[PDB]
Structure formats: structure tokens, C-alpha cells
Design a protein around this nucleic acid. Structure first.
Lengths: 171, 135, 197, 189
RNA sequence: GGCCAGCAUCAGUUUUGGUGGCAGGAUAAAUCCAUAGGAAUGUAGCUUGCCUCGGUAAGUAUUAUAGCCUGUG
RNA sequence: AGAACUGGCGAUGCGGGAUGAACCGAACGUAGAGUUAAGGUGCCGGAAUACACGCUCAUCAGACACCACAAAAGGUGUUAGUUCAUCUAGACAGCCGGACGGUGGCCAUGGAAGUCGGAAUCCGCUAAGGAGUGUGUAACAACUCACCGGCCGAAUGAACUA
RNA sequence: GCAGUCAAGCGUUCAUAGCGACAUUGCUUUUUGAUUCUUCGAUGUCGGCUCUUCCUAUCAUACCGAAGCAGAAUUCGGUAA
RNA sequence: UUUGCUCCACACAAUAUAGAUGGAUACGAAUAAGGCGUCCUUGUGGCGUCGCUGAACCAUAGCAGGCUACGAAUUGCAAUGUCAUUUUGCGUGGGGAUAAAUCAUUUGUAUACGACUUAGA
């Protein structure tokens, strides 16, 4: 999914008594500006007394990456509703941007725990700054010093349906 | 003890600075260098001279060439363009017959009709001058 | 494009060869399968033998000469798996199934004629290394095929005779590879390296 | 999960070579010639020393480490069966009927035969395998010895002698007889 | 003197390509250049067991005979 | 069996659900082209043996809601995760050494130092060893061992979730 | 009908070598109870004789396991029609 | 009474198209492993090269391709542009071969009838 990390500002409507309600900020992950606002008004509605017709979406802004050519050790916190009892989880992604880490968060979350996008709240996406605090083994086996590995069995892509010679798979 | 004959395979290992080749996509067929790995399936490539930008691509699109050149981990485009020209990769690549065959295969579909007919004339002379000499 | 396509079947998957044959023989390409006893099939041996002794049970229980005719040869198992994938009840299915012959081993109608290999159906390309395959000759002999020793002898008697043809061809080939590699330096070839060939 | 690499290594002693290609491992050592096929596990060997040899599997997915460690220990046992061998010493137990075990030179193998086992009159037949050297004990008159090179023969033959001496439909905790392996020593120690 | 076809210039409904001009955005973010700061999956120099010129090791040091990131322009 | 509201079927074909009165899409004059709906694209079968991340190998797998059935309970089979956690002052282990003397502390007595058994409990040596965890002689013996110590320099035990 | 899940207590102090309560949960169409869907311009109705094929939830035969199993007969189950 | 009948011939005419119009162009075997070449103390060898598509390899110059050693404009701006190939008849010339079975009749090793089974110049 081509996600786009959005930044939304929302406020209650100005009352004649107090014409300055506080601007609340969210930085969410959504596919476009419509479900951006509709996931904003579902998160803020769990926290403060405001519906969609009682407040105005002040500002939409895309958040492009601070460095989109750098491998980052993301530690994402998440909660998700299972088929019985909701749970807190903390995964580990090693992709290049916050936009492209949450996709493969959702993919393997729907793969290993069968939770769809309507059951998942992304809590906090933090780039871990060093190698000490990260404790997931599927990243501590990737960050190793001067890592080499081969791809042992490279199958061939095909274009025709009659190869005149026996295939070689050696790489 | 006498010497042991142990051999399995000589892989072309995906390592730092492995000169890899994009086989699918918009910028396919131009060289690139694996800067640093990301996961099992996607690496970070950066090839300055050939025209590709600095991307993070699957290993499905790429093809590992046997020739490797050195660089430190996480290298930027400037440092890899320095190491690229100082290691002379674009000249060392064309010496392989794989690049020779890929240029010949590029040329054959670039031939026009009269360049095909002159091939049809010239292919009536090589065997005509050779196949009488084997007796 | 050759009108009689000789599909070798050493280590092809059964269903994946059956589909790419039943689509090709429906359009007119006269396909002959050769060495259909070396066909492979997914899953282990003791799963597929059970899925065949779960098929031998099905027969018309008022007269057993009417229902499912369980052909047990490793040619005709692939033939059943192609008869399933074409509509053999119609007439287009009959005139398409007439365009297919299936042999075990290599009969000398097709001795010296070129074997081609289906790439999308190969075991070495379509299984994961570590899963269990099953040789179709290993299956049919367990389920009641009396013809392994005849085909094994008639096949390796062919292979030992074919190896000396290859030994003659490999001696003949380096005659041309010594004549032309000492004559490719000339201007007749340098006028062609500017044309790609 | 997927791994990247785990590795074991085989440590060869003095006198032995290992000539391996296409997953057929081999030992031509001070006593024997063990060829052992390994054609279904997708292992990779690579020589680092004349004294030890790397044997490493890549990613696999933890259904492969259980293969890599057993394929390490298989070649370890296959080497040490030629360097020092195996020697299983088995012993008769009998309550009343004295057991008679002997050999015979049949037209098949050297068929070791056991009779008088709890008074039975069917003379039992056990074949021997090829590398399994069978001998007796002439200090204690109740003891037999198997030895050889390959563990899947020299222990399988003791298994074949300890399988068929099975008490049928009587209490095993009251009628305790048969032949039993005691000392799994080595042929030079 | 008809009917039946071919091609061209049109008209309607389309369906499929290559290229250009303009705007918006963190007046895109990046890469690139300049400065400061820092750290290790530590780049040279320096104690350190022979080997092969620092190679063996792991300490020393934070840009040197590689480079990396953060903050700014 | 009986009501409430809407839609349907009766009166209604067509594309999909293998076929099905009610479901899904859609309602119909005859024709040509384009576009889709619901549904699908290995083959029968029109259409990607397309791309990408994962998980499963079932000796009765699994594959389109209605639907043509599936529970309560179990499996270190695998995969992800939560929370305590012994513990680099060498944890648990895996091989190996001790388990000592004060002291047979007292009753059952035909025979019981710890041990067919019972009311029951202080100290030395320390690196540590329980009037004591079982085998055992009618009884004394001799092992075991939580407790330390030699090696190991690697960590890991524990419950639970989906 | 009992095939499964928890099994007080008993079998000489001896919870699953076995049995037997409190009681929870889900099969089966082979009963009966239930509705009234299919023929009221009739599908011949019980029972036995005869004859073929099938199912497993095994009474016997085959092979095992575990049984306070000395043998022996029992008894407890497993694959198996 | 080679009127018959078949085998080779191209002689004519007619017939069915599951669909020929450059070429079905041959090692085998393993894929966590191979092919090909050089050399030797001919091996599970030391060495080199190669695959990463058969997009290859062969043939294709000439009335759908002729004389000898120029020839085909005016099939008029496209109108299959026929040449395929298993069959068969009729006629010509060139060789060859000289039978069986069924009914009827009989038999009982068979039998409802058909069928089986034998016997008859």
C-alpha cells in the first residue's frame, strides 16, 4: 500500500465564550487525505469531546522523509484487537523510511496475527538511534559486522514455454 | 594426512559494494552498486555514472555480477562515485563476454534491413572459404 | 513451431505439465511426451499412494466393468491428468486428444529427435528444496504396474548406445571449433563484428 | 523467521581424508573406506583447513539447523568409526534353559543362529552385515562381540540380535532373559 | 448503368501510445557544496607472541593514507 | 405456531453463487461499438502459471458470504509476543570431587545412627554438605543428592497470550 | 445409544491398573416425541423364508501395548471389517 | 475365356482434410551443483573459460528462381496466388501369383436356436 504519513491539526468549533480551543495534532499513516481525516476523527473522538460536525480540520500536511536514503532501525509500538482480548505489541522494522516501515508492519501483522487494518492502532514509530536498545533477534542477526551471505538457489524467470535445454540454477 | 577433495560451490555473494545489475523496472539494464543490505530481500543501490538514482530495491529486480569493488558501509553517492571511477568498473565490465554478448544481442535487434542483407552476403563467404580446407 | 513437439518429462510436476500440455494441444501443436515414467509429483510417497488407494476404491457397485477405469501405467496417469483438463466428452476434446501421444521411456520413433523441456513446470524450479517429491515410476510399481524391469533395461540400453553418438558428435564439433577459431581473425569476420554477428 | 547462516565444523584426526562432492561424503582412513550418500539434505561443505572442514547451512528456517547438526555429527561418527571404530559387547542371560548361539556359513550371509531360547524348538536365524566383525569371548563363556566401521551397521546388527529375542505373552518383569549390549567400547581401547 | 472491395480527406462514439508548456508542495523532500558537533559495526598512525612491511588478536585514539550521522546555511 | 418494518418471490428473464423461486449484481423493444457491475483470470473457461510481505506440509489439508454443519477440550508442531525472572561476584546444565566429624540427639524393641516407623531440631569445619532425598542388612555398611567446589564463558529457566 | 471433558469416594492408608457420584460440553437418524413438507383420480401395510453388497461403535480370528501380569484363564485398551 | 487379380511406372481424372509452406537442430546426470577445452602423479584431479536465455545454430542472391557461361513491362494501385498427401478408379508397359471359406451333409467332447467341435472327392 502506498502510504503517506500525514500531519493533521484539529480544533473544536469556536464558542462565543471561549474563542480559542486548543489545537490537537496527530501524525498518522493513511493512504490519502480523505481517510487521513477519517482516521483523525476516530482517534481524537476517543480522547476529547468532539465530533466531525463540531470541529474543523485546520491543516493537512504531508510529512516527507527527513532522510529517505538511509537504513533506519525502527522500533514500532502498536496495539491490536484480536478475536478475543486486545493486546499491546512492539515489533521491529529495518526499512528506509517511516512511510515504508508501516506497510510491512501491517503486512506481517495481518500474516502472523490475522489482524486487518480496521483493528490496528499505530502508537509510536521511533527510529532507534543506536544498536544497544534493540533486542529483536531478526534485526540483531542483520546488523552484524561485515555480513555476507549468498543466495543459493536462484530460479530462472521464463519468457517462453519450451526451453530447449535443461536449466541451470547455480548463482 | 593426505589432501582432502572438498568442494561444493563458489557463489557470487551479496556483500558490500557488489556490482549488481537491474533486470526489471524503469531503469533496468544499467549498473548499480549494493551499498548496504536492508533485509533478506531488499538492498540499497546507488549507481552514479550509469544514470540510476539511490534507491532501495528488491533482490528480484537485480542480478549479481561476479565483479566486486570495495567501499565502506552506508556510502553516499559522492563517495561511491569516487570509488567507482578509481576502481574503473565500467571499463572492467565490458571486458567480460557477458557484456560482449549483451552488446551483440543489442546490435542484432538494432540492425536495419540492408545491414541484414549484407550479413546474408557475408555469411556466404566464411564457410565457403573454410569448409574446403578440412580434407 | 516444430509440428511435433517432443516434451521430455524428467522431473516435471504432473499437474503443471498437464495444464501446459492441455492448453497447447487444444490449439493444434501435436505434443508427444517422452519418458513419462520419470514424472514427479508433489508431496511424499505415502501421501500420494494413499490418494491413489483412495481412488481405486471408486467403482460402479452393480457391475465393476462400467465405472472408473483405473489405468495404472505412469503414461496413462499423466493421460488421465490431461483428460481431466480437456473436455473429452465433446468432439473438440476428442480431436484435441488425438494430437497427444504419451510414452514411457524413449521409443525409437523418437530416438534421434530433439527433446524439449517445459520451464514453468520443472521440479527444480517449482518446489522448495526440502519438500518431498515422488517419482511416478516409484508410485505405479507399488500400485500394480508390472513393467519396470523391461522399461529400465530398454532405456539404459538406449542410453549406453546414445553416449557413443555423443562421443562422435563431440569429436566432430571441435573440428569446426578449430577451423573457425583459427579463421575468425580475418577481415571477413571483422566486417561482421561491425554488424553484430 | 529466516536465518542467514549457521555453521558446524568437522575436525579430522591424523591419517584420514574426506573426498566429498555432490553430497556424497567419503573417508579412506587407517582401516576402512566409508562412502555415505547424503543426497536429500541441501548442506554445503567448504574446506578451511586440512585439520577441519566448514559445514554450513544458510537461512533454511530452523527446520534446517536440526539437519545441520545431525549431518555434522553423522560425519563425526563416520570418521571416528574409522579412526577408533565401535565394539559392542553383548552378554547372555538365561534362567533355566542354556542359550545356544553360534554361526553358520549359509549360501546367503554368515547367518548367526540362536536356539534353546526359553526351550523353543524353532532354530532362529540372524544375518550379519558386511563390515560387522563378529567374535566370541573365551574368558567369560556368555559373551559375544560385534565390531566394525559404520554405526548404522554395527549397531543395527546388535538391534537385529536384540529384537528377535523377545518374550511373547509372558511377563517381562518376571521372565527376564535375552542377550544384552553392555560395553560400547572402542576397538583399540 | 448498379453491386462488391481498396485507399485518401471528413464527421460522431471511442480505445491505445510518444513528447511539450504551466502551477502546487517543507515554493517538494533528497543527493550536491560549506561549517560546527558526535559516535562505533573504529579509517589510518601507537603499545602488542613469530609470521608476510602493523599483519594475528583487543586495548589506544574520533579523521588521518576510508568514510558515517546529527544541527544549520 | 404467531405478529411488527422493509425488500423480495408469487407475475421476473438475463451476468454471478457448479445446478437452487427468495442470495449478489441488475430489472428486458430490435441491432453495432465501447465501458463495467457482482464474480473471477493453472486447465476445462473468456481473463496475470502477474508483482510484493508473511504462515502452513495435514498417513480423512485448504479453497467464493447466504451454504448445504461444526464444538468443549488437548499437541515444546511451528510462528510472533507479554510479564516476572536465576544471574559474567560464573545461574540452570553437561562431564567431575566432597556430603564431614559434635552425634547412635530420643521413642516403638522381637530388630531402626536419617531412613517398617512416630511425637519431632542445636552447633563446629567452612568453599559447602538437610538428626536429612530415596536403594539398603533382622540390624551396622555402600551409593544417590540441595548443598558447595573443578571445567564452561555460553547465557537462560518460568508461566501465559494469539 | 453412549464416543469424547472434569472423576467425590471405593478396589486392605494405595484419583485416572480400573470403576462410580456432583455435573459441564458437543455427536448420531439407527428410536420415539414434534411439526405437516411428498402421493387422498391408492408409492401395496407389519413378521418370517430367500439373496447380494456395505458400515464400525469388534463377539470371535490376526498382531501389539499396558495391566497388585508366577504360569494359565481372565480383565484394561490400540491398529484392523 | 492374364475377361480376372495384385506388385512397379507416371498417364489421366476424381476423392478426404483437426489444417505442413525454411529446417522435430538427439548425450546422460546433478541443481547447496554443472557443461566444454588444456595438462598430468587418468582423479570425487591441478588449470582456464562459460552460463545470467534458443533473441541461439544451419540455410535463404537466380521466371516460389530458367537457358547460355541477356532473360520475366501490358496478372495494369490488393482480389488464394493453388505446387500440400495419406487414399482410389480407369488406361498404357513391366514383372508375378495359380486359392480358400460358408450353406447343405455328418459327428457329440457342444448345444434352446445361433455358436463350438469333428468326418467326407
Amino acid at each position: 500500500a502506498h502510504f503517506k504519513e500525514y500531519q493533521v491539526i484539529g480544533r473544536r468549533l469556536p464558542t462565543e465564550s471561549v474563542p480559542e480551543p486548543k489545537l490537537f495534532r496527530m501524525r498518522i499513516f493513511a493512504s490519502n487525505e480523505v481517510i487521513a481525516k477519517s482516521r483523525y476523527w476516530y482517534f481524537l473522538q476517543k480522547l476529547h469531546k468532539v465530533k466531525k460536525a463540531s470541529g474543523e480540520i485546520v491543516s493537512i500536511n504531508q510529512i516527507n522523509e527527513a532522510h529517505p536514503t538511509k537504513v533506519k532501525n525502527f522500533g514500532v509500538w502498536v496495539r491490536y484487537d484480536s478475536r478475543s482480548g486486545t493486546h499491546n505489541m512492539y515489533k521491529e522494522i529495518r526499512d528506509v523510511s517511516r512511510v515504508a516501515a508501516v506497510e510491512t508492519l501491517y503486512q506481517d501483522m495481518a500474516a502472523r496475527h490475522r489482524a486487518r487494518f480496521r483493528s490496528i492502532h499505530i502508537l509510536k514509530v521511533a527510529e532507534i538511534e543506536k544498536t544497544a536498545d534493540v533486542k529483536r533477534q531478526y534485526v540483531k542477526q542483520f546488523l552484524t559486522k561485515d555480513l555476507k551471505f549468498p543466495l543459493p538457489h536462484r530460479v530462472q524467470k521464463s519468457t517462453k514455454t519450451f526451453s530447449y535445454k535443461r536449466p541451470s540454477t547455480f548463482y | 594426512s593426505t589432501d582432502s577433495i572438498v568442494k561444493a560451490s563458489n557463489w557470487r555473494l551479496v556483500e558490500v559494494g557488489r556490482v549488481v545489475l537491474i533486470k526489471k523496472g524503469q531503469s533496468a539494464g544499467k549498473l548499480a552498486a549494493i551499498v548496504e543490505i536492508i533485509d533478506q530481500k531488499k538492498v540499497l543501490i546507488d549507481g552514479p555514472k550509469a544514470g540510476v538514482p539511490r534507491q532501495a530495491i528488491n533482490l528480484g529486480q537485480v542480478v549479481l555480477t561476479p565483479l566486486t569493488f570495495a567501499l565502506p558501509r552506508g556510502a553516499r553517492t559522492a563517495t561511491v562515485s569516487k570509488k567507482w571511477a578509481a576502481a574503473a568498473v565500467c571499463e572492467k565490465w565490458a571486458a567480460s563476454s557477458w557484456a560482449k554478448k549483451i552488446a551483440q544481442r543489442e546490435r542484432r535487434a538494432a540492425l536495419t534491413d540492408f545491414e541484414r542483407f549484407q550479413v546474408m552476403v557475408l555469411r556466404k563467404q566464411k564457410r565457403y572459404t573454410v569448409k574446403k580446407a578440412l580434407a | 513451431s516444430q509440428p511435433v513437439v517432443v516434451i521430455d518429462a524428467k522431473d516435471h510436476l504432473l499437474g503443471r505439465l498437464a495444464s501446459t500440455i492441455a492448453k497447447q494441444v487444444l490449439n493444434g501443436q501435436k505434443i508427444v511426451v517422452v519418458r513419462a515414467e520419470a514424472l514427479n509429483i508433489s508431496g511424499e510417497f505415502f501421501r500420494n499412494k494413499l490418494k491413489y488407494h483412495d481412488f481405486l476404491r471408486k467403482a460402479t457397485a452393480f457391475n465393476k466393468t462400467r465405472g472408473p477405469f483405473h489405468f495404472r501405467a505412469p503414461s496413462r496417469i499423466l493421460y488421465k491428468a490431461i483428460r481431466g483438463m480437456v473436455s473429452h466428452k465433446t468432439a473438440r476434446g476428442k480431436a484435441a486428444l488425438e494430437r497427444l501421444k504419451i510414452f514411457e521411456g524413449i521409443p525409437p520413433p523418437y530416438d534421434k529427435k530433439k527433446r524439449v523441456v517445459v520451464p514453468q513446470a520443472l521440479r527444480v524450479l517449482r518446489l522448495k528444496p526440502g519438500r518431498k517429491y515422488t517419482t511416478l515410476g516409484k508410485l505405479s510399481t507399488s500400485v500394480g504396474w508390472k513393467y519396470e524391469d523391461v522399461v529400465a533395461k530398454l532405456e539404459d540400453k538406449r542410453k549406453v548406445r546414445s553416449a557413443e553418438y555423443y562421443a562422435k558428435k563431440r569429436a566432430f564439433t571441435k573440428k569446426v571449433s578449430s577451423a573457425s577459431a583459427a579463421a575468425s581473425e580475418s577481415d571477413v569476420a571483422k566486417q561482421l563484428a561491425s554488424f553484430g554477428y | 523467521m529466516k536465518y542467514i547462516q549457521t555453521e558446524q565444523q568437522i575436525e579430522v584426526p591424523e591419517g584420514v581424508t574426506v573426498s566429498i562432492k555432490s553430497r556424497i561424503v567419503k573417508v579412506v582412513g587407517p582401516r576402512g573406506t566409508l562412502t555415505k550418500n547424503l543426497k536429500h539434505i541441501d548442506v554445503t561443505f567448504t574446506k578451511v583447513n586440512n585439520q577441519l572442514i566448514k559445514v554450513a547451512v544458510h537461512n533454511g528456517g530452523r527446520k534446517h539447523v536440526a539437519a545441520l547438526r545431525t549431518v555434522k555429527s553423522l560425519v563425526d561418527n563416520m570418521i571416528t568409526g574409522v579412526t577408533k571404530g565401535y565394539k559392542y559387547k553383548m552378554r547372555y542371560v538365561y534362567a533355566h534353559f542354556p542359550i545356544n548361539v553360534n554361526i553358520v556359513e549359509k549360501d546367503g550371509a554368515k547367518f548367526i543362529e540362536v536356539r534353546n531360547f526359553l526351550g523353543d524348538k524353532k532354530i532362529r536365524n540372524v544375518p550379519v552385515r558386511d563390515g560387522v566383525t563378529i567374535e566370541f569371548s573365551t574368558n567369560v563363556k556368555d559373551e559375544i562381540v560385534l565390531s566394525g566401521n559404520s554405526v548404522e551397521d554395527v549397531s543395527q546388527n546388535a538391534a537385529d540380535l536384540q529384537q528377535i529375542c523377545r518374550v511373547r505373552n509372558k511377563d517381562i518383569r518376571k521372565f527376564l532373559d535375552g542377550i544384552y549390549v553392555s560395553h560400547k567400547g572402542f576397538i583399540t581401547e
